[PDB]
Design a protein around this nucleic acid. Sequence first.
RNA 1: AGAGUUAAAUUAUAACUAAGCUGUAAAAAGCCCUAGUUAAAAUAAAAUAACCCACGAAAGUGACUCUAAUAAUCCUGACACACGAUAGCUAGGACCCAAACUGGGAUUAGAUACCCCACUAUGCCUAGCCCUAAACCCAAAUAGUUACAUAACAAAACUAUUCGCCAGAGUACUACUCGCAACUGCCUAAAACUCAAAGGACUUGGCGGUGCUUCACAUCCACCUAGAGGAGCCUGUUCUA
Lengths: 96, 208, 136, 86, 23, 71, 116
Amino acid sequence: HRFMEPYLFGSRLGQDIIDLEQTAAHLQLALNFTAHVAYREGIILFVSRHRQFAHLIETTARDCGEYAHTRYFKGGLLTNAPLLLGPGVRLPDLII
Amino acid sequence: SRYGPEYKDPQIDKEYYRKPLAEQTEEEKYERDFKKTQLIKAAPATKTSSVFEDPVISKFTNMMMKGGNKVLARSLMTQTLEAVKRKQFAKYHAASAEEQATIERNPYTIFHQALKNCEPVIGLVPILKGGHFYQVPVPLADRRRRFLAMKWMIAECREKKHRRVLMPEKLSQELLEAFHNQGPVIKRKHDMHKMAEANRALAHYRWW
Amino acid sequence: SFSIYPPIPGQENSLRWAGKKFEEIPIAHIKASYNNTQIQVVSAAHQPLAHASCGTEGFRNAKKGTGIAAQTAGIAAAAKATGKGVTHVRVVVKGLGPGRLSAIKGLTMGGLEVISITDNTPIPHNGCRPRKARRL
Amino acid sequence: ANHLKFIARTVMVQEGNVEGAYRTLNRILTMDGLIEDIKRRRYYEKPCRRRQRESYETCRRIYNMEMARKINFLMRKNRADPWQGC
Amino acid sequence: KNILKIRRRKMNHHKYRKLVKRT
Amino acid sequence: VDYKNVQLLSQFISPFTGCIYGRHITGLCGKKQKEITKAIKRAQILGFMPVTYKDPAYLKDPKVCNIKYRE
Amino acid sequence: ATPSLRGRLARLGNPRRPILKPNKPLILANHVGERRREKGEATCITEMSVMMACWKQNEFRDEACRKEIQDFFDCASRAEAARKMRSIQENLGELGSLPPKKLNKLLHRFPNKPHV
RNA sequence: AGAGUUAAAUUAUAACUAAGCUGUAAAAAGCCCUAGUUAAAAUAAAAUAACCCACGAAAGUGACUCUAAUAAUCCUGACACACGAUAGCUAGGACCCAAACUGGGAUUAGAUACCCCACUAUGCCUAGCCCUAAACCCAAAUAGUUACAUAACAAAACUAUUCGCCAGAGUACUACUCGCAACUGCCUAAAACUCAAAGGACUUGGCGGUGCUUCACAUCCACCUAGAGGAGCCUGUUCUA
Ligand SMILES: [Mg+2]
Ligand SMILES: [Mg+2]
Ligand SMILES: [Mg+2]
Ligand SMILES: [Mg+2]
Ligand SMILES: [Mg+2]
Ligand SMILES: [Mg+2]
Ligand SMILES: [Mg+2]
Ligand SMILES: [Mg+2]
Ligand SMILES: [Mg+2]
Ligand SMILES: [Mg+2]
Ligand SMILES: [Mg+2]
Ligand SMILES: [Mg+2]
Ligand SMILES: [Mg+2]
Ligand SMILES: [Mg+2]
Ligand SMILES: [Mg+2]
Ligand SMILES: [Mg+2]
Ligand SMILES: [Mg+2]
Ligand SMILES: [Mg+2]
Ligand SMILES: [Mg+2]
Ligand SMILES: [Mg+2]
Ligand SMILES: [Mg+2]
Ligand SMILES: [Mg+2]
Ligand SMILES: [Mg+2]
Ligand SMILES: [Mg+2]
Ligand SMILES: [Mg+2]
Ligand SMILES: [Mg+2]
Ligand SMILES: [Mg+2]
Ligand SMILES: [Mg+2]
Ligand SMILES: [Mg+2]
Ligand SMILES: [Mg+2]
Ligand SMILES: [Mg+2]
Ligand SMILES: [Mg+2]
Ligand SMILES: [Mg+2]
Ligand SMILES: [Mg+2]
Ligand SMILES: [Mg+2]
Ligand SMILES: [Mg+2]
Ligand SMILES: [Mg+2]
Ligand SMILES: [Mg+2]
Ligand SMILES: [Mg+2]
Ligand SMILES: [Mg+2]
Ligand SMILES: [Mg+2]
Ligand SMILES: [Mg+2]
Ligand SMILES: [Mg+2]
Ligand SMILES: [Mg+2]
Ligand SMILES: [Mg+2]
């Protein structure tokens, strides 16, 4: 992608390599964030379409008391919540 | 059509049922048949297990029936088989020993023969090309050919008799002449064959 | 290495049909035109032994186009040729038309034995301009 | 016409099967583009109307080449799928 | 489409040439 | 590439036609294809090499190109 | 190898003059062209002709030649069963490639990207 | 731009051989001084290579060889200068093949057309004109940038320096002028009048004697049966009364 150009480190023989220093700086902040939301008792929704890992991510999330959505994603899901999910509903506080 | 597609046809031949024990794939097959809990059709009233039933005669019988008269068609046929029979007995006793060995006294063999001999090999279908209808040579499937023979016999001995002449008689004549290939029916078969030979070039047109 | 097709005009190749050199075997010219076909069977010496046309075979203005007609002409041609006693034929097809294959088959089925097919179909290297295309 | 005869465009039928040898010769001419040229040259075709042909042909050849490649590249993944009904 | 402009021209030209022949 | 070695130029010509194979068959650089082509045409007009068929002498020589005629 | 597209198309940058004028944009489509149904020729024509010749020489007595006739019907049954077989044959495909349904799913799984 | 050369094909014209040969959806006319084969100059046009993308300012240029040869230490620039496809004009040659015109033949209600057959101006050369093209890549030249940014569609968006061009639509590649080897021409190019539009791109429909697949199950075709149209009569319309 064109917007990875900063996060990259450099090309090794055609294969691109991320900057792990930046990975840590970022991931720290991400995990911190995740945590501060969990502590504040709010919904967390993991999402992936990737098949290899589907099971993992549900198996992970079920054990967190957090929710996963790994599946076909119906269209108006978050946008039109009350029609899709139920008459009135709470929405994910954080999506991951 | 009061039969759904679930109902398969009856197989009515008795020789099949009485003597299964030497046939493996057929044992397997009729096992599949009734075991399948197969809904099977009430056998028709025309089809019987009678030792005397010749399906060809039945078809030809039907095609002669106008309206709903089975009775009448049956009778006309019966009288035709009969008429040929007696006519061939008359030819027999008035002949010489050699020809006594020759002559066919079986009206049935005479019938299957006189139909085998009247059936055309090729036939024409019209093809539309560039505005004109060309009559083109088409190889034919057997049943269509049988039909053409029977249809022809019936139409011929229906149309061209003088009114004082009964159907079974004339029909018998046409049967015995078609036996020896000298009959008008075969003239018809031959005009088919000739028309096919004249148009043979156009057998390119046909695409199937 | 069996049956390399193009036998050389040098004498290095001994292969005989009816004990003859490939040079001595009769040439059957086939000309397949869209409306016509004609075969002419000629000696290696160029003395014509047989001629059959789709028209000479008694077909008419359209119908003489067909492959039927082609094989028809082929048969009788090989009849006239067989009469003068030619066993084997090297064939050349000229033009590209309906009765190419049909006529070639017609020589075989007509009881004439075929060794070679070669295609001489005139292919302009951009000489004379063709007639204009048609609808226009 | 000045060249030695019978050397050009000549197949010699082997084991007496004619139809096979004719198919062979046909495959020759059609492989070299001579059939498309005879057929082309029955009538004329004007220079413009010719570059149009050329370009349409060559575009189409590019498309089909690429699409072919893409198909044969994605061929592997036709294999029956591991993750089914996740 | 733009042919519809050309049509006019085409006609006007034709109708002119015809004229200049008679005249 | 010289127009003088007709064997070489014969290597790139279709045996039955006398055609000149394209790059996609011969597999040559641009400059070498062009070189070969011109060379051939020269060899044809000067008449070291014939036009409408591959000289029989050279049919038995090593074959470079990727064409399969006979299958 | 794929024909070079460099410099071919009429574009603002290009100093050259055009080579290809595409009718439809040059992009791999997602789907693939549906199978082309092949047409028929006249079936059996040979035996038809042979049997014609036979009747011509024999003054149209069918009893004189059984051979040409039985071979004719041989061809008719070979023809009809060839049609039945080419009807059930739809598993044919390309015989070494895959039917255009498979290609189209497969191609939707790794689509081509014009946008972004 | 010269000068020289020819491989395929074709044609004269002979030698044989057969009566046909040509031609379409189907035919006809046409030709048998025809056709197949074997020989063979001129003229004309340059398979494959080319799935290449070069050379020229553009038009254009792709058979072969040799001669001459492709402006500018390189910005823009005309009504000036020099060129400019086809067709056309003038004079002289050429004439294989093609072919407006025209005459036959079909088709058609008609067919001054599409299809067929001949044959001509003309394409060809040498010299002189004419100066027009959907001469269009509809995208000006020369330096740049990929920042900002999607009317639509198409070939994504823009600076800077220039010249050229555009003020509703017709009217109008027209009328008058001016100039030109043109004198049914080219170039330049209005107004009266009329209208409230005229235009570009798109959107759903509908439609298509477009293309592709798949069907029709009393159903188009092929197929089977029995009838209507004819006759007498019944009975309903339509006309006369
Ligand atoms: Mg060319
Ligand atoms: Mg036009
Ligand atoms: Mg010759
Ligand atoms: Mg090509
Ligand atoms: Mg007007
Ligand atoms: Mg340039
Ligand atoms: Mg250009
Ligand atoms: Mg377009
Ligand atoms: Mg000159
Ligand atoms: Mg020559
Ligand atoms: Mg000649
Ligand atoms: Mg000649
Ligand atoms: Mg035709
Ligand atoms: Mg006539
Ligand atoms: Mg080409
Ligand atoms: Mg080019
Ligand atoms: Mg320069
Ligand atoms: Mg300047
Ligand atoms: Mg000019
Ligand atoms: Mg001129
Ligand atoms: Mg002339
Ligand atoms: Mg002359
Ligand atoms: Mg002419
Ligand atoms: Mg006329
Ligand atoms: Mg009409
Ligand atoms: Mg038409
Ligand atoms: Mg002439
Ligand atoms: Mg010129
Ligand atoms: Mg141009
Ligand atoms: Mg253009
Ligand atoms: Mg302009
Ligand atoms: Mg400028
Ligand atoms: Mg400049
Ligand atoms: Mg910028
Ligand atoms: Mg929009
Ligand atoms: Mg105005
Ligand atoms: Mg003008
Ligand atoms: Mg003017
Ligand atoms: Mg002026
Ligand atoms: Mg009906
Ligand atoms: Mg219906
Ligand atoms: Mg009636
Ligand atoms: Mg009535
Ligand atoms: Mg009333
Ligand atoms: Mg009244």
